[PDB]
Amino acid sequence: MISLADLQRRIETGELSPNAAIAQSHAAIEAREKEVHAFVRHDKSARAQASGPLRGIAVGIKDIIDTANMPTEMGSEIYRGWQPRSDAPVVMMLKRAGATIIGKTTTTAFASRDPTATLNPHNTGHSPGGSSSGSAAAVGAGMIPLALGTQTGGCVIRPAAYCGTAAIKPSFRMLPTVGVKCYSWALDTVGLFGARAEDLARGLLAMTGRSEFSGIVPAKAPRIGVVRQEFAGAVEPAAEQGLQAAIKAAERAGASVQAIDLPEAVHEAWRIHPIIQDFEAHRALAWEFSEHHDEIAPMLRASLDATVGLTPKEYDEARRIGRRGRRELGEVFEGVDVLLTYSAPGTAPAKALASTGDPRYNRLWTLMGNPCVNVPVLKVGGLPIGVQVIARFGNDAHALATAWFLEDALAK
């Protein structure tokens, strides 16, 4: 994989030229697209910009995020050839920083369950996860140093884990979702894919100008609270193997690790995530469902069909539960700096299963809103397994710092 931070340092010293960096990405893409299929469209004419911390940095954009110079097809036939008039605010954050928008990465139809043609870089016979399939794959295949995606259930953390890349779903609403095809406005959150935690930090710094992302360094003696999300059901062996490897590494590195069971209020929040998501999706995708029903991809069409009956009453109740959940989760962070858990059920599923993976270990955090970061840990049978670092809402910096600490710990 290509490191954003690496590129930055070398370009800043003149050791590497922006044009060369971009030519390298174009090369990497051409070198494996026929194998991975992570791009809906690749702008081969894309060139590096003259100034900015992200000059010479090629970025892939999930195709539900608006671009003014390239179509935004939402991974749906309904939007084939659709051309937005403007670039989404998050795209502008990158462009204003000097980044090069190299192309649109594949997305499942409307960021839901329907698999794209994209394949896992680590094993062509496996899924790269979803819904940010192309962003995770492209970064995992070393095609680009950065990619944008979104998370409603576990659309960022899960595919990142499956593809062995670092990634972060910042605190809810930190990055605007303006110009981002909505699935559930209570959940939709923009995320970033990179090679390492440090790459994510430098990316967020350039996009937001927030001092909190400046000068981040690996955390020291982090206080970690391990949660296995029992309420999420039975995890697969590989996932647990990765979590134990992470715990062992952190302990040896000086971290204090303790197991903790999450409050009933949190278990409940996890249960009602589907209610909030699906009730809102019917509103958010009303036009598509009412006017182009049969054109909606199979799996998404099915989930919408099964949920037309969700009522405002139960929706309100679900949101009440969500709030109770957030309140009691905050108390959990009184004794620990971060929480550590699974990023996915296990290794990436074989493409034959026609599944981008179950988001059961991701969805709770998207609703709570806390910053989540995936940390590659190991590989079982050649397929990546990662762990998920979670900090208190609004403390994305500490989440990245601990993720960094963890990466260094695993490196022994």
Add this chain to the structure above:
Amino acid sequence: MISLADLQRRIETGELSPNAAIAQSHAAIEAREKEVHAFVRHDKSARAQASGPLRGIAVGIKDIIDTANMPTEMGSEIYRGWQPRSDAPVVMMLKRAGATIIGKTTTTAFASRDPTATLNPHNTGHSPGGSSSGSAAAVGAGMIPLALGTQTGGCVIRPAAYCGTAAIKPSFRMLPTVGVKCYSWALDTVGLFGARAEDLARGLLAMTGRSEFSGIVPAKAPRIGVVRQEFAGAVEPAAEQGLQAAIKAAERAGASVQAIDLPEAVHEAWRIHPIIQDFEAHRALAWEFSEHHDEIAPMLRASLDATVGLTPKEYDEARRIGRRGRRELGEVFEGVDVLLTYSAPGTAPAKALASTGDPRYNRLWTLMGNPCVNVPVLKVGGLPIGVQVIARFGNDAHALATAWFLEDALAK
């Protein structure tokens, strides 16, 4: 003005057919549009639907709200001829209920300060307010029974007051802002314009299906708390005359009215509203500011040029201040059912002043999120004056019930 509730009842009993109702509207628009100029686009072929609670109900849509069959120009040359692919979820809420989208109403450029060409229905020499200029003017001129607008500062309540129509800015986020051109995502709130409070209730019931909007009837002897928002300075004589008249009518109607002070935390929230608004505006309108700077309407261009330096730091600090204001405001509603205040600084400004009016008496409430309803009180020099009824967050139904109470009280 045309009453949606009235049309509903007559259509329900069969006294009026949906086709006739819609023909009524087309005729009403035809009758005054040449003098008011409230529509960017009037779809003369718009027909009535055969079923639904809103069948036969014509609705005007502020032009920053996406429509699939009509252009959405954002009141800016930058979006001349722009055609969204899909109808915004709120538009679909109306369509699914059986309503007719009769046209797009005027909006100031990107819903900011730059005046549209629309004129006040009560005196064409005056402003109809903004930024939901056309929606307020159309309803006020008796063209349509319902219209959608948005409020970031006071874009719903102020123009409603100026044009003498009933209107409501529901609780923050009750209605989705998907497909609604964003100015400030922390503030933007969809609102409705109608003849009376009952019309708003029926409109919200059909759009949301929420039982809270079903069976609403005038409130009885409400506990009203009068707040003059001294932090925003003294209001113009006409506005105070309308407030005094509303208090007296309410009292003689059996309501308990007490002048109350607003917590310092709330005063502070009003103060930092511009910080949140303008900082986000720079991110939400990034593409426009970067690629079409000189094409942005003059006033908005100037406000943006003067706020480029706002920092994430002061922004976060403003948000913290706003959250504290919301908390303490709720406390105020523990002893009072609704707050009663000004809807605008006074009567509508002369067009010659090139101003849609000062939003100072509206902005706080948009940030707090509470449901606000405008109640027409009287007219000074032929120009309408209204009062603003505010309930606790999530108590939209009560705001409407008390507004209805106030309307009857004023009618004695």
